[PDB]
């Protein structure tokens, strides 16, 4: 997208979201990132929404095919699962490459740095979901390390009700439960995150209250499922 204006790429990313053309949206936002300028809060959200939808479709397809493959155990089901898996890994590698070149190193504010590091943890987590061989442990540790740095910054720099801090804790708790085989750590993190946010709600406006309580409900939904 080197020949398109940055502002036009952002505008078309918003149009693609309205049209539910998430592959286009991701390509537009990849082009915007590669312009080399830092991203605004709104622009970071567009980047995240685009790739979450693309990878979300790939993850759903991989789970369908992996389930069919396990029920069978010709080469077609394995071959097609491998093809979807390779495409998923390519998308994750593309996102991680954008974070590494050079979104994270130029992110100095807590809101931007925590956002990108949470993304890094998320896309290593998606890689871990399909990983088996020599690198699954290293991918898991890469996810954990990114989540952990984001946690450390968010505890120092953000109030307990900050939606980025809450969503980071939510996803790190899912990492603990689903990836790291640490359900007790998952439950403890979700509980402490919820309780500390509850105690900070009195400081918020009506609109901020709605934003934070929505994510706290997701933490509560998981705790209900895990206990």
């Amino acid at each position: 997208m080197g020949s398109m204006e940055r502002a036009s790429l952002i505008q078309k990313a918003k149009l693609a979201e309205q049209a539910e053309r998430y592959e286009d949206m991701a390509a537009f936002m990849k082009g915007a990132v590669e312009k080399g300028e830092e991203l605004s809060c709104e622009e970071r959200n567009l980047l995240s929404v685009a790739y979450k939808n693309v990878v979300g479709g790939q993850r759903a397809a991989w789970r369908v095919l992996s389930s069919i493959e396990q029920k069978s155990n010709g080469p077609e089901v394995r071959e097609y699962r491998e093809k979807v898996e390779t495409e998923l890994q390519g998308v994750c590698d593309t996102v991680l490459g954008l974070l590494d070149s050079h979104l994270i190193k130029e992110a100095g504010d807590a809101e931007s740095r925590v956002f990108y590091l949470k993304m890094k943890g998320d896309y290593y987590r998606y890689l871990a979901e399909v990983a088996t061989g020599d690198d699954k442990k290293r991918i898991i540790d890469s996810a954990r390390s990114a989540y952990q740095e984001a946690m450390d910054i968010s505890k120092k720099e953000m109030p307990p009700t900050n939606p980025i801090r809450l969503g980071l804790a939510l996803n790190f708790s899912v990492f603990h439960y689903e990836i790291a085989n640490s359900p007790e750590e998952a439950i403890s993190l979700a509980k402490t995150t919820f309780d500390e946010a509850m105690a900070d709600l009195h400081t918020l406006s009506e609109d901020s209250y709605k934003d934070s309580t929505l994510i706290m409900q997701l933490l509560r939904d998981n705790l209900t499922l895990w206990t």
């Binding site: 918003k14 979201e17 995240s48 939808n53 998320d122 939510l170 899912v174 997701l218 895990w226």
Partner: peptide
């Protein structure tokens, strides 16, 4: 277990 949906801006 639900992660952040994050599919709508």
């Amino acid at each position: 277990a639900g992660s952040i949906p994050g599919r709508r801006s």
